[PDB]
Amino acid sequence: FVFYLPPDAGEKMGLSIFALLTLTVFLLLLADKVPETSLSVPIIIKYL
Amino acid sequence: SEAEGRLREKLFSGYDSTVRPAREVGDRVWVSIGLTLAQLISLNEKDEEMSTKVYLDLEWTDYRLSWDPEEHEGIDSLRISAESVWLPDVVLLNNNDGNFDVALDINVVVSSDGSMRWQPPGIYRSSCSIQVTYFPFDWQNCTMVFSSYSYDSSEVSLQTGLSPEGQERQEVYIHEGTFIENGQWEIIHKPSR
Amino acid sequence: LNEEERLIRHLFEEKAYNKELRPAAHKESVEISLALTLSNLISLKEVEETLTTNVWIEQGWTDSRLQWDAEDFGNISVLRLPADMVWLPEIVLENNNDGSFQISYSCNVLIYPSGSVYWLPPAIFRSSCPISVTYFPFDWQNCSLKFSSLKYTTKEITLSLKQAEEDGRSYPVEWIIIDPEGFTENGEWEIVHRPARV
Amino acid sequence: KNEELRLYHYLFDTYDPGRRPVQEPEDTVTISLKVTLTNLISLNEKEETLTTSVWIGIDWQDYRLNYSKGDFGGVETLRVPSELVWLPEIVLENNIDGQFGVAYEANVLVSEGGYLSWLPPAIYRSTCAVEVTYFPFDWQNCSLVFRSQTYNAEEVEFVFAVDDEGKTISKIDIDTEAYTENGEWAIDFCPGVIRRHDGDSAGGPGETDV
Amino acid sequence: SEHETRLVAKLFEDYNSVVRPVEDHRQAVEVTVGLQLIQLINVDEVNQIVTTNVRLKQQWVDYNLKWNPDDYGGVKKIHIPSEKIWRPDLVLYNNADGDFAIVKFTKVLLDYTGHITWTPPAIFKSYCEIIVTHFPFDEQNCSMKLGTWTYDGSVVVINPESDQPDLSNFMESGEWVIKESRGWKHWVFYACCPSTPYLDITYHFVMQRLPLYFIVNVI
Amino acid sequence: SEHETRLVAKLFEDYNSVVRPVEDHRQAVEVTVGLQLIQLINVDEVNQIVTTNVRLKQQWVDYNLKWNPDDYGGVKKIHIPSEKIWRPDLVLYNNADGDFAIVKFTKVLLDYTGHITWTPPAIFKSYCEIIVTHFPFDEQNCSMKLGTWTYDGSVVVINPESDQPDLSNFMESGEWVIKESRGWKHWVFYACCPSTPYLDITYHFVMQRLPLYFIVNVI
Amino acid sequence: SMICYNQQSSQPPTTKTCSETSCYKKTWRDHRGTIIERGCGCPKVKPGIKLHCCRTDKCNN
Ligand SMILES: *[C@@H]1O[C@H](CO)[C@@H](O[C@@H]2O[C@H](CO)[C@@H](O[C@@H]3O[C@H](CO[C@H]4O[C@H](CO[C@H]5O[C@H](CO)[C@@H](O)[C@H](O)[C@@H]5O[C@H]5O[C@H](CO)[C@@H](O)[C@H](O)[C@@H]5O)[C@@H](O)[C@H](O[C@H]5O[C@H](CO)[C@@H](O)[C@H](O)[C@@H]5O[C@H]5O[C@H](CO)[C@@H](O)[C@H](O)[C@@H]5O)[C@@H]4O)[C@@H](O)[C@H](O[C@H]4O[C@H](CO)[C@@H](O)[C@H](O)[C@@H]4O[C@H]4O[C@H](CO)[C@@H](O)[C@H](O)[C@@H]4O[C@H]4O[C@H](CO)[C@@H](O)[C@H](O)[C@@H]4O)[C@@H]3O)[C@H](O)[C@H]2NC(C)=O)[C@H](O)[C@H]1NC(C)=O
Numbered sequence A: 001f002v003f004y005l006p007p008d009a010g011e012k013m014g015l016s017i018f019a020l021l022t023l024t025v026f027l028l029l030l031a032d033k034v035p036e037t038s039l040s041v042p043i044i045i046k047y048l
Numbered sequence B: 001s002e003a004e005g006r007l008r009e010k011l012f013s014g015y016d017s018t019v020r021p022a023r024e025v026g027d028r029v030w031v032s033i034g035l036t037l038a039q040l041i042s043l044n045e046k047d048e049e050m051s052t053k054v055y056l057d058l059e060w061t062d063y064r065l066s067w068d069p070e071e072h073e074g075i076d077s078l079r080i081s082a083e084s085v086w087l088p089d090v091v092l093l094n095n096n097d098g099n100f101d102v103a104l105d106i107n108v109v110v111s112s113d114g115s116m117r118w119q120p121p122g123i124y125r126s127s128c129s130i131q132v133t134y135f136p137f138d139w140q141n142c143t144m145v146f147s148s149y150s151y152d153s154s155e156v157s158l159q160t161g162l163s164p165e166g167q168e169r170q171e172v173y174i175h176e177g178t179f180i181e182n183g184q185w186e187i188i189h190k191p192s193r
Numbered sequence C: 001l002n003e004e005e006r007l008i009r010h011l012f013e014e015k016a017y018n019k020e021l022r023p024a025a026h027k028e029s030v031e032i033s034l035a036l037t038l039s040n041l042i043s044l045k046e047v048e049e050t051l052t053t054n055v056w057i058e059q060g061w062t063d064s065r066l067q068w069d070a071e072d073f074g075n076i077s078v079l080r081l082p083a084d085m086v087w088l089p090e091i092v093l094e095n096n097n098d099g100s101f102q103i104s105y106s107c108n109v110l111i112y113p114s115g116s117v118y119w120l121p122p123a124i125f126r127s128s129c130p131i132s133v134t135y136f137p138f139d140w141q142n143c144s145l146k147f148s149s150l151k152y153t154t155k156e157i158t159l160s161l162k163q164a165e166e167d168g169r170s171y172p173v174e175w176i177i178i179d180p181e182g183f184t185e186n187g188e189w190e191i192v193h194r195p196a197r198v
Numbered sequence D: 001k002n003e004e005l006r007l008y009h010y011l012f013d014t015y016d017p018g019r020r021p022v023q024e025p026e027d028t029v030t031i032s033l034k035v036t037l038t039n040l041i042s043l044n045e046k047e048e049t050l051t052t053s054v055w056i057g058i059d060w061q062d063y064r065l066n067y068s069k070g071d072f073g074g075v076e077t078l079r080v081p082s083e084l085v086w087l088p089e090i091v092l093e094n095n096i097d098g099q100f101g102v103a104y105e106a107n108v109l110v111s112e113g114g115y116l117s118w119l120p121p122a123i124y125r126s127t128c129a130v131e132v133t134y135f136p137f138d139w140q141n142c143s144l145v146f147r148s149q150t151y152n153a154e155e156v157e158f159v160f161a162v163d164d165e166g167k168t169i170s171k172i173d174i175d176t177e178a179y180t181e182n183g184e185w186a187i188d189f190c191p192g193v194i195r196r197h198d199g200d201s202a203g204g205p206g207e208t209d210v
Numbered sequence E, F: 001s002e003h004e005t006r007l008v009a010k011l012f013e014d015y016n017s018v019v020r021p022v023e024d025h026r027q028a029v030e031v032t033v034g035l036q037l038i039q040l041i042n043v044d045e046v047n048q049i050v051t052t053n054v055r056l057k058q059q060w061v062d063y064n065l066k067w068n069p070d071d072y073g074g075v076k077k078i079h080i081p082s083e084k085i086w087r088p089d090l091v092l093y094n095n096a097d098g099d100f101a102i103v104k105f106t107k108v109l110l111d112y113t114g115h116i117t118w119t120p121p122a123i124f125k126s127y128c129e130i131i132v133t134h135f136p137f138d139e140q141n142c143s144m145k146l147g148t149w150t151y152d153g154s155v156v157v158i159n160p161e162s163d164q165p166d167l168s169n170f171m172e173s174g175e176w177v178i179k180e181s182r183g184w185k186h187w188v189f190y191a192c193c194p195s196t197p198y199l200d201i202t203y204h205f206v207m208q209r210l211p212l213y214f215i216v217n218v219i
Numbered sequence G: 001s002m003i004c005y006n007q008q009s010s011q012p013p014t015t016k017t018c019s020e021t022s023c024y025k026k027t028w029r030d031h032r033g034t035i036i037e038r039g040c041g042c043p044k045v046k047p048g049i050k051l052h053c054c055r056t057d058k059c060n061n
């Protein structure tokens, strides 16, 4: 929905990059749950 | 019971608990191994280890521990401390923490024909190779390998241990009333080979 | 020391006491009476689903071999012996989740001229308490401590609750005993019910 | 083993490990101490705990274990389990995990003239007060106090070991060829000092530690 | 050393560790109990535990372990393993998740008089009501109740060695300051038994937290 | 099993486990040492510790544990406890924080010729210098130095069973792959004693980290 | 080429031939005693190890 925001509102970065920040927070959330082996990649990490 | 004491003295006169029961040289000891899962504690992925609480079910025959019940006031069974009789050296081979043994030393039930039944409890941290590709929608195949550490096939022979039902089982036994399922894991198949 | 040591020689050397033999006939079961005292509730780990308790378990049973006439031993009325000298029913926590079935401190037993044996081993137990998270952080949990003998069956021993007396009337102790003066409540858990069942 | 068995029967048939090797009670057992640091495992700052791996060289004399090479076919030394000989119960006093003793109770070497050498290894978790003012650019002063657990300074006395030149080794020994430095900690100094203190009652027996 | 070996051989020829070491069974064993605090290891507030390093000095007299020094080469004191002799069964009643009794069985010092001094170490993990009202400026009062677990006051009497715990070898704590420390003996009588007291010695420590860490990193 | 009961009673009626199992004290005990790597448990790069699951097969001849099989029913090959016989005191010299020697005393397999096979398991926590400069594409060479702690090379000789560690029962790791492995015997002579050598066997393993986890989750 | 000594501490002397232009004697001490290692080259030593590199024939000992 950032592409539906007008350019004259001046809020495209403040939305999309903060979504990126929230995604980093969820990466921190999963940092202590997933296996640490390197034979394959978890599908949830692929999705993230 | 005094008759019980006299029976125990008669049975353990000249008995060596470190010597395998084999009347003739070349005789094997047939050991029947079953397992009852009391609780699946955990599957830790970061350590690749499954923690379980189990009861083993070990059955064999010691010819030296037989008696006539009619000569001992009708006693046809005994409950003897496990350190006093010969045990098979059955261990969990794929342990992950360095522990091979059972959790508690309990009694062995000895019948008048020499049949030995030992059902020790155990807590086991066995090795599981986690397949991570579909985590957390994954299923895992965790094995518990039990074997005699010392005796080879010419001395101790293993077989799958029968359930209380008198049929050739191939399955881990789970008591459906007293088993609380793990909140993270569902047991689909639980065979034994 | 004289009558104490005399009684010990009489009971364990003159009578040739055997701790491996249970104090009963071959077809009779020994009645073991159990009570539990909660010294403190340490923690309930939610992620590990583990309840840690400091509990003193009181075991009572009659051993007819460990009896004497008090007048033959200078009116001695109680003896204290190591638990590794007498027969024990070997009560353990079946419900543990760390492999520690047994009590912590194997203290002395107290035996009496009637043959009654009293034993109060304290223990620290880590048991499996599954967690219901539906109403968190307003949830309540139902943990249990299951005590049984893995060395003996119903034909060998009989488990029962402790019988206490008030005003000459007997009642079974159907609750966990908490000393009200000495108990410090857990910091995040308040106890609502303490039942006990056979 | 035809002579080692003879020596073992000659030495340990009438021997009491519970008694000090002294002909008189007022005599003192002198013990040469060396401490070799194999690894500096960690300094847990939150737990304030130094974890180290050490080998403790202890040398003393036992007149009851005296023998001669010529009367036993040339047996210079005999290796015996450490429970069959009297030991000085050396413990790390400033331990934090409750462990006072060594990790592996190795064999003691009994030589000709009653000389007894014991090199048990140990893993030690000791108390280190972490001075926090200059963290993370700080340096720390961590201590290892060794003392006899049951004997006083009038029954057990401590001296330092000596090198091939006879100089007194008043430091932690480090195998410089085999040493791997800790990834976070560099050892700058390791002096050793023998301390003697007045007893718990004035006029009574004193106490000593290294 | 041969006199000492002979003495130890005679002392433990007809010895019973189960028997209370008094001449007559109707008198109590006289035990003196002192507590030495080496280090305050940690105060865990969530589970209300205080873990400490202590030495538990216990002094009594064994009636059967007497000898005349003139018959044994002048030896007056020996060192004896504690597992060979009768001991009081001192237990931390308010233990949280540590050891109830002494597990490190060190050697005792035994005189020709029969006086036994036993100073084993222990890690005491004790339950303490923690008041967080004034945190991080809180004052705590934590106790160690000690008593003979299976012996009552009629058969074993325990007395404190001093009014206060010994803090002469106390390592400085970086988080707490011990403001006060004392030890109190308590006699407890029950309604069903008016003749046998139950004795305990409770050593309490009033501690004040140093608040600089939480001032800097939170406030 | 009455023949073997007779044999076990006969073999340990005058047996001594302290002294070395040789006919003459001037002979060294010849020990064959092999290391089996079952699982690489962990590589802790902060504290520089490699945790492995191993079996330490030790083979040697006991001179005093031989018998005629014809005198005992044809029994040739028995199993006895390891606690009651002489053993080598094999210590892991570079043990970080685990066990220095074998603590799991499994059974000894004993031939009628006195040959002993003893294969106890162990968890080896070995100190390894960890190079982190190329992490997560790093290569680590980590070793296990094993030797008789209190026996020099003139009284006990240790020989490698093979120049390679046994990897036939090695469980595949998810984070490391073993590119090469070897075992080297080393003789050390000291300036004071020209005559007595000191022997060790150092097994080493060169391992390469699988970098996929750190590629995906960090880079 | 160049002839260097290559025996260990207090052992009977033995020699070897090598293409480097330096012999080395490396001495250190462990808990048991003094180890001396002889060879060719001028290796890099850890701190605390006495190193003596020389440029002529049979100069280790
Ligand atoms: C923290 O925390 C902690 C805790 O943890 C705490 O601590 C605390 O502290 C406190 C203080 O502060 C304390 O208190 C104290 O204590 C003590 C002890 O107690 C105990 O003991 C006692 C005694 O006993 C005996 O005696 C009796 C009679 O008397 C009898 O009965 C008995 O049996 C016994 O006897 C025996 O012995 C004797 C000797 O001794 C002999 O003789 C005989 O024969 C016999 O043998 C007792 O009594 C007690 O008891 C009580 O208590 C309990 C509880 O605890 C209870 O249970 C019981 O019941 C009782 O009670 C009652 O009493 C009380 C009082 O005590 C009240 O309150 C109630 O109500 C009731 O009535 C025990 O067991 C004590 O002793 C003390 O006392 C004192 O004080 C009071 C008041 O307060 C009074 O009343 C009294 O009388 C006393 O006084 C005295 O002293 C003082 C000082 O101390 C002074 O000042 C005064 O003046 C007086 O003096 C006098 O006297 C003395 C003596 O004789 C003399 O010496 C002088 O010289 C003079 O003459 C107190 O109480 C506590 O305990 C603690 N706790 C614990 C430890 O636990 C802390 O504080 C905290 N901190 C913060 C918060 O900061």
Ligand SMILES: *[C@@H]1O[C@H](CO)[C@@H](O[C@@H]2O[C@H](CO)[C@@H](O[C@@H]3O[C@H](CO[C@H]4O[C@H](CO)[C@@H](O)[C@H](O)[C@@H]4O)[C@@H](O)[C@H](O)[C@@H]3O)[C@H](O)[C@H]2NC(C)=O)[C@H](O)[C@H]1NC(C)=O
Residues within 6 Å of the ligand: D141, D143, D193, D195, D196, D197
């Ligand atoms: C690292 O920590 C070490 C302590 O573990 C530091 O060593 C200590 O340094 C202090 C001075 O900073 C010394 O204190 C001095 O001691 C002398 C002698 O003490 C006299 O009295 C005692 C009884 O109270 C008696 O036992 C002695 O024999 C002496 O008669 C005093 O004269 C001084 O005034 C002062 O108090 C410590 O003694 C010393 N401990 C030792 C050497 O064991 C060390 O300096 C620290 N290293 C650093 C920070 O670089």
Ligand SMILES: *[C@@H]1O[C@H](CO)[C@@H](O)[C@H](O)[C@H]1NC(C)=O
Residues within 6 Å of the ligand: C070, C071, C072, C073, C074, C075
């Ligand atoms: C014990 O008490 C009774 C009380 O009637 C007395 O008759 C008896 O002599 C006392 N002593 C003994 C040794 O029984």
Ligand SMILES: *[C@@H]1O[C@H](CO)[C@@H](O)[C@H](O)[C@H]1NC(C)=O
Residues within 6 Å of the ligand: D061, D062, D063, D066, D067, D113, D114
């Ligand atoms: C050992 O015996 C020899 C010969 O009697 C003697 O010279 C030497 O001093 C003795 N050593 C000790 C420790 O007494």
